[PDB]
Design a binder for these strands. Structure first.
Length: 443
DNA sequence: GTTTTCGCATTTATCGTGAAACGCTTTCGCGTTTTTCGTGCGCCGCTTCATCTGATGTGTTGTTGACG
DNA sequence: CGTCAACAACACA
DNA sequence: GAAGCGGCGCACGAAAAACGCGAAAGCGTTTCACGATAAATGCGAAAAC
């Protein structure tokens, strides 16, 4: 078997291979002289004469390589210690603690002393630690497991969210860190739409999508991706909105569902609000520094515009020359899209949590929050004329004073109905009664 | 009686054989050689300490209140 | 007095 | 303002592949003997001219 021999040739150093290379023409030339029947003496004297080599060495090596085939002649020319201590050390390093090697080793020395174990050299120990596995380190921290056709413009869009590090004073006066959801065209990388709000919830996604399909339309083959590899909650309209299934609406749009920090967060105008990744940051300065919602949102819109308009984008489509806007304007004109009807757009208007319907076929929504306070009562004959107890109300905040649309709890449209700080005081009082009691318990 | 051929003897030559000697190449044998491989320690440079740590959304269950 | 329905908390992803 | 852990480079020593000197055995071609046989030459005698 020439496998072990050739692996020995292979594993040899460059210097060793060079040595074999140097020794090969001398052995081969020698073979020629003997074939001619030249005296061994004259042949070796001649080779040792022309080539600087010991005649005896050449002779000996020739006989050694004689038994080997000629193509392989080159390849021819080329810790006992206590397992308990070793196990103890390995056991120690693999702990999530992951102590320093030299110190863990010293501890091991103490244990070895107590048990009388014969330990190997620190260098040997660590060497063997390297020899263990890439997987073992992960075994200690569970780390690696945490890592592990033609596309038209508008054909495939990706949705992503972003939590801002900038403090903004919102429309309701509260100072918060806004969260914005963005829709991006996968091919051209152009941002097609966005919506910003006080927290992460479906509304910003839904409405940014609405912005995207209203502005650019709905393609005939529509793919949407949100990599997850429901929001709702009370009551910005004083009535709760909403536990639903957005999923159905997306599938209905004819969409197949799949599962700037420099421009916004780092813009000069917000410098008092953005703190930066500062581990130590004084909280005493910031209540005054929080920027206005209008300024933040304007800076955001301009940041998006500048991100899209930025040339020198290194992508296939831009070829290091054009901007996302250029390639989007170019490719969008080569795709076939359809505009959404008024009805479709209205079906996307916001869902209110189920309200009770009386025997008379009327129900109530207590309007408030960002809208003018009022207790709206809606009515229709179809509500009293068939089976219903609870009903989901779909509405446009701007049209609450006139027409809403009632749906059954399972989603079937029934008919439309015509129209015939509050809880924050409790929230604040609760806050004070917390803080005072908390300080009193701390002391 | 003179010459020539014919029969017998001794000496030398050579073969066929068998065990044998030399000379060439081939190996292995052992003393002294040469490289590679581990074990081992010491030094240098980088980085943290001079003050550091936990959540959210939705569903289900339990308890309590209201209603029959 | 008994049962049912809703609200609130805790646990889970 | 201070110190430790990690990582890398240099040296020692020892074992395993090695090297140069040999040397003997394997082995081929050649060796010598030894001896025996023929055959080639030696001599003489008898027949021949």
């Amino acid at each position: 078997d020439r496998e072990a021999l050739w692996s020995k040739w292979d594993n040899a150093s460059d210097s060793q291979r060079r040595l074999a290379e140097k020794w090969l023409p001398a052995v081969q030339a020698a073979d020629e002289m003997l074939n001619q029947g030249i005296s061994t003496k004259t042949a070796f004297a001649t080779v040792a004469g022309h080539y600087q080599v010991s005649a005896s060495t050449l002779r000996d090596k020739y006989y050694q390589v004689q038994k080997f085939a000629k193509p392989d002649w080159a390849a021819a020319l080329v810790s006992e210690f206590d397992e308990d201590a070793w196990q103890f050390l390995i056991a120690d390093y693999l702990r999530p603690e992951k102590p320093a090697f030299r110190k863990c080793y010293e501890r091991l020395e103490l244990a070895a002393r107590e048990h009388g174990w014969s330990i190997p050299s620190r260098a040997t120990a660590f060497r063997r630690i390297q020899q263990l596995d890439e997987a073992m380190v992960v075994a200690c921290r569970e780390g690696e497991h945490a890592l592990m056709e033609h596309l038209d413009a508008m054909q495939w869009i990706n949705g992503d969210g972003y939590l801002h590090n900038v403090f903004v004073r919102w429309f309701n006066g509260d100072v918060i860190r806004p969260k914005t959801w963005f829709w991006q065209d996968v091919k051209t990388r152009k941002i097609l739409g966005w919506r910003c709000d006080v927290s992460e919830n479906i509304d910003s996604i839904r409405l940014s999508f609405m912005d995207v399909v209203t502005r650019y339309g709905i393609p005939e083959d529509f793919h949407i991706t949100i990599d997850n590899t429901t929001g709702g909650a009370p009551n910005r309209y004083r009535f709760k909105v909403k536990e639903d299934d957005p999923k159905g609406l997306f599938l209905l749009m004819g969409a197949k569902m799949h599962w700037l920090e420099e421009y916004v967060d780092k813009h000069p105008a917000l410098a008092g609000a953005y703190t930066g990744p500062n581990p130590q940051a004084k909280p005493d300065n910031y209540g005054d520094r929080a920027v206005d919602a209008e300024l933040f949102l304007k800076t955001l819109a301009e940041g998006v515009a500048m991100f899209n308009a930025r040339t020198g984008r290194e992508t296939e489509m831009c070829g290091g020359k054009l901007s996302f806007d250029d390639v989007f304007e170019r490719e969008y004109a080569r795709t076939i899209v359809r505009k959404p009807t008024e009805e479709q757009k209205r079906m996307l208007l916001l869902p209110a949590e189920a309200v009770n319907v009386s025997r008379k076929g009327e129900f109530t929504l207590k309007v408030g929050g960002s809208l003018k306070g009022a207790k709206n009562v809606y009515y229709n004959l179809a509500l009293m004329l068939a089976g219903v107890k609870k009903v989901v109300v779909r509405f446009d905040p701007q049209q609450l004073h006139s027409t809403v649309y009632c749906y059954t709890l399972d989603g079937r449209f029934i008919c439309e109905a015509e129209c015939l700080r509050e809880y924050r005081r409790r929230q604040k009082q609760l806050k004070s009664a917390t803080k005072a009691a908390i300080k009193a318990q701390k002391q």
